[PDB]
Write a protein that binds this ligand. Structure first.
Ligand SMILES: CCNc1cc2oc3c/c(=[NH+]\CC)c(C)cc-3c(-c3ccccc3C(=O)OCC)c2cc1C
Ligand SMILES: c1ccc([P+](c2ccccc2)(c2ccccc2)c2ccccc2)cc1
Length: 165
């Protein structure tokens, strides 16, 4: 599997986080969540705020300590008075394995997520289960077979994996 190693400083993310019981069939809920954010003008409003620290819209999967799973639609923004309407989180600095899913959204993303899932199974000491992972949707036609979604998986100590020696 191909991936790029990337590192991010700590960032401020502005958007809306919803919380789902399962994290399993949440895929249907996540679909509805995207649809609602588009319909209610939230995507458009967040786009205005995107400072380009990351060049697109994020779909973050956030683990909850009670076992629930949250999904946050967000952009990187300047920490400046958006708490009144939006959720604002700090995304703690981390290294990442960054994968590319090429094809029409969401199917290409789902298929790649499955492959990533199977792949990182061999890196249990290096992935970070408590840290958010995310989809990154940069500018483009998400219905195009050429469209690329990035999948960002946080890692620690990856250099020590015996695969790299
Ligand atoms: C700039 C990013 N723009 C978009 C990003 C999106 O990410 C999605 C992630 C998903 N899960 C995690 C992979 C699921 C299930 C649906 C998604 C849709 C989606 C949700 C509801 C209905 C249709 C779509 C959809 O994909 O319509 C075709 C584009 C989606 C749509 C747009 C428009
Ligand atoms: C609990 C919650 C999330 C993960 P995981 C993961 C998958 C495969 C092997 C190890 C870990 C994940 C990844 C993609 C989709 C669903 C779950 C995961 C979480 C954070 C960082 C790396 C991997 C694991 C346990």
């Amino acid at each position: 599997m191909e991936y790029q190693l990337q590192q991010l400083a700590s960032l401020t993310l502005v958007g809306i986080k919803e919380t789902y019981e399962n994290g399993r069939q949440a895929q249907q809920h996540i679909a509805g969540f995207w649809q609602r954010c588009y319909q209610e003008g939230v995507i458009a409003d967040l786009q205005l705020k995107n400072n380009g620290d990351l060049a697109g819209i994020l779909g973050l999967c956030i683990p909850e300590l009670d076992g629930k799973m949250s999904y946050m639609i967000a952009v990187t923004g300047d920490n400046s008075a958006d708490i009144a309407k939006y959720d604002v989180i700090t995304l703690a600095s981390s290294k990442y394995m960054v994968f590319e899913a090429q094809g029409a959204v969401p199917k290409a993303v789902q298929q790649k997520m499955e492959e990533v899932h199977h792949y990182i199974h061999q890196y249990q000491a290096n992935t970070v289960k408590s840290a958010p992972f995310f989809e990154l949707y940069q500018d483009g036609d998400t219905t195009s077979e050429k469209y690329i979604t990035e999948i960002w998986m946080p890692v620690k100590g990856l250099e020590h994996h015996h695969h790299h020696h």
